[PDB]
Design a protein around this ligand. Structure first.
Ligand SMILES: CCNc1nc(-c2ccc(NC(=O)NCc3ccc(N)nc3)c(F)c2)ccc1C(=O)NCCN1CCCCC1
Ligand SMILES: CCNc1nc(-c2ccc(NC(=O)NCc3ccc(N)nc3)c(F)c2)ccc1C(=O)NCCN1CCCCC1
Lengths: 463, 463
């Protein structure tokens, strides 16, 4: 990895565009204007890409050679990068302040700030904007995942009277559905801030190395079938496949995809009749989890439950909602996103089915179908010092008032009512709103403050 | 990187689910049912993750330790992995056949197949589905980018009479809008299959290391401003910032963001009057490229062109369309996706503006706002050998006919009319449709056939 080649191309030419005699460039990151966001992911970036000796004589030469052809011109700041190598032994003379990870903050507030600690490196601040802005991703995955948990908690509480098993109702099925291996790990780790279920193995290793947990692992899975393990037996032998699988995993929970040919026939005749004896004998610690995987998500779930309710003994919990026996559950993992999840639990409640009967799996909807525009994640310069005089800078496009950026030195505070407020123009300097909530997390090539994955989860809890 | 920890969790348990006495598992990839797709990206995966010695005693132990806790049970196939380590020195006993990279194939055709070469490793075929399926991303980026080139080619030819500069009309602005550094490199390289302009530097190194070009680099850029380099001068000094920037880059093309405060005032008064003398003097090889970055994309472009056409000498080309002077152009790089791009060129044409005047920049829309569902990318088992007998495998969900998979051994052929057809059930064996277009690209831990980035671009050319 070469940090000199890890920025938007045009940033290579910025050192020749700022006003002469500029000694400081101060910038901040915010989610402009999903009313609250979970701040998570910065720590990973600081350790993997920004800390330690990130500049070498060879990295400078390589960058120079690429840029010469890329621009068909010599515009690369070789002297500037050589200064960092010689003066700081390749360590970045930058200071980053940020809100603690796992913190849930309302939109339009400063989440972190970046600035240079050496006047010679005034151009460095925005050089690293590209790398830091990518924090939008783990922030968005964690936020959207937490919003789904809110919906699940509401309906589970209404239909059951408690939140037992909540942290297991949204399972990560997105490994193959993301853009890369690195994204898989970052995204899966962000989802684990809210839940404990994942099949995206890559997330475990990331958490262990960059955050850490008291427990051996932060996420869990159970044995389960895929279409290949069912269909390989032959069209006419779906029953033999089911029987063999549940027998191989008879003492632990097992998820079995049942829509290979006819989900309704499988539920009613196969599980419901032919193999019913191997199901009602299962332990409460090892239920069979039926998994449909096609058709209209809501219609399929409701019909599946109606069928099962007629083949198995259902009870009525204390809230008046129907409950399948303890050795039988369902997981809907097709076409699930924040919107369809809401429709399903609502539809279930209307038909008097408890949310305890179901769990949801989500792939593309959880880890891939998200953009930097969802939460309006933005990085902008708000303050500079030129000729020894600091000025508050900002943008304010006429055609879009929402793109208006904040001015001057920023700080985050608690309001008298216990809410959040971002003070601009160095006003935090006045002690009218108490202490600044941001903490220095990076300074001159070193990580100065960190959080365990356990603290992050605590910070991200629901009210 | 540990391949044993690079799969969907449940696949760790599949070796106990296949029918007993199974010696072969054969699977394929396709974009079910954007009528044609560009096949690209597999080579990167084969070299980075699948080739050479991918198994060690340490990797086996590491995987075992993680899985024991992840599943809270011992279900890991230690024996299976140890067999590969001792017998093939950690090399994968697998064979992958694929259509040449860059090839343009219609939907619903086999793109690549996977199978085990050793009977003991029948479970390996689908273990690596997760890694291989991620090819959906570079395939999708390349396909979506090519479809945008088609729109541009159509309108440019209509308004200008030719396609000069077409390969520079869609620029990659997505570096910060993607989910990770790795994705950035993959996505940027996929766009470069169709165009020559990028600011996502990461793509260059990926191409050079895994594919290669005759030229030094495959992508180019020009110096340009960002809001920070304009706003840092102070609200009242936007003109000073502009003057300084175009003067620092007086002999090469230069892109200048002009919507900091008022894009329309900037075009008409600043560029149009105050600094008009530094513009009209510019060389045809170094034009000023004005860049709006806010407001309704179509309304903004049209209004900017109307303003410029009144402050600078416009000519009427041989097609009757309006053309700005050679030292002046425009780039719309906000809110650009496949849909808005089409609305812009159509709006420009109705107003009699030539497409020569403009280029487009795209970030999230080009590299992030895409899913595995866009082209219905799917990997499925179509053939197995059990008890020495081969059988055709497939799924056919009752609620979704579109989810039906192909059966048996597959092969891709040219039709008599020069189109494409995928033969099922080993019917390719009969020599009725000529030669199979799929080639062995990987076998037993070695890449057997590779393509240069130059061949790939050639294969992906527009008709
Ligand atoms: C409603 C089900 N409940 C739960 N389901 C799961 C659960 C269900 C399914 C899968 N996997 C799966 O479907 N794999 C397919 C797949 C995999 C990858 C991919 N890419 N695509 C598809 C899984 F990993 C976990 C876990 C916990 C609970 C839960 O409630 N635990 C708390 C219960 N607790 C206290 C009471 C006594 C028992 C212990
Ligand atoms: C209509 C414009 N035409 C062209 N524009 C560009 C072009 C325009 C703008 C930018 N960069 C930019 O806006 N950067 C901002 C930015 C950066 C990152 C980020 N994340 N966000 C925003 C760029 F890199 C390239 C290139 C070639 C042509 C073209 O036509 N060349 C071939 C014709 N040419 C041949 C040689 C003789 C003269 C005629």
């Amino acid at each position: 990895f070469n940090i000199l080649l890890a920025t938007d191309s045009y940033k290579v030419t910025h050192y020749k565009q700022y006003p002469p005699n500029t000694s400081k460039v101060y910038s901040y990151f915010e989610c402009r204007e999903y009313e609250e966001t979970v701040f998570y992911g910065l720590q990973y970036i600081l350790n993997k890409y920004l800390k330690g000796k990130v500049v070498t004589k060879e990295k400078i030469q390589e960058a120079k050679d690429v840029y010469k052809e890329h621009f068909q011109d010599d515009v690369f700041n070789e002297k500037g990068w050589n200064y960092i190598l010689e003066k700081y032994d390749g360590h970045l003379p930058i200071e980053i302040k940020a809100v603690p990870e796992g913190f849930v903050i309302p939109r339009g507030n400063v989440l972190f700030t970046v600035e240079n600690t050496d006047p010679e490196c005034y151009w460095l601040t925005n050089w690293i904007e590209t790398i830091l802005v990518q924090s939008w991703y783990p922030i968005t995955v964690a936020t959207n995942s937490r919003e789904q948990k809110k919906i699940l908690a509401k309906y589970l509480l209404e239909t059951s009277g408690n939140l037992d098993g909540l942290e297991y109702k949204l399972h990560d099925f997105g490994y193959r559905g993301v853009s890369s291996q690195e994204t898989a790990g970052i995204g899966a780790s962000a989802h684990l801030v809210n839940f404990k279920g994942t099949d995206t193995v890559a997330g475990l290793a990331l958490i262990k190395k960059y955050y850490g947990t008291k427990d051996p692992v932060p996420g869990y899975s159970v044995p389960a079938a895929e279409h290949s393990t069912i269909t390989a037996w032959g069209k006419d032998h779906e029953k033999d496949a089911f029987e063999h699988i549940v027998t191989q995993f008879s003492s632990v929970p097992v998820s079995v995809v049942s829509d290979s040919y006819d989900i309704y026939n499988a539920c009613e005749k196969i599980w419901g009749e032919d193999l019913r004896h191997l199901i009602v004998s299962r332990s409460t610690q090892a239920p069979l989890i039926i998994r449909p995987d096609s058709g209209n998500p809501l219609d399929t779930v409701l019909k599946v439950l109606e069928i099962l309710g007629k083949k198995f003994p259902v009870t009525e919990n204390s809230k008046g909602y129907k409950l399948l026996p303890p050795y039988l559950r369902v997981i809907q993992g097709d076409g699930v996103d924040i919107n369809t999840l809401q429709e399903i639990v609502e539809g279930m409640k209307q038909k008097m089915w408890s949310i305890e009967n179901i769990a949801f799996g989500s792939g593309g909807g959880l880890l891939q179908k998200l953009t930097r525009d969802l939460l309006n994640c933005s990085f902008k310069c708000s303050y500079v010092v030129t000729n020894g005089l600091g000025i508050n800078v900002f943008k304010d496009p006429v055609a879009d008032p929402n793109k208006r950026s904040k001015k001057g030195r920023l700080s985050l505070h608690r309001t008298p009512a216990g809410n959040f407020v971002t003070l601009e123009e160095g006003k935090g300097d006045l002690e009218e709103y108490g202490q600044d909530l941001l903490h220095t997390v990076f300074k001159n090539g070193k990580v100065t403050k960190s959080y365990s994955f356990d603290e992050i989860r605590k910070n991200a809890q629901l009210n």
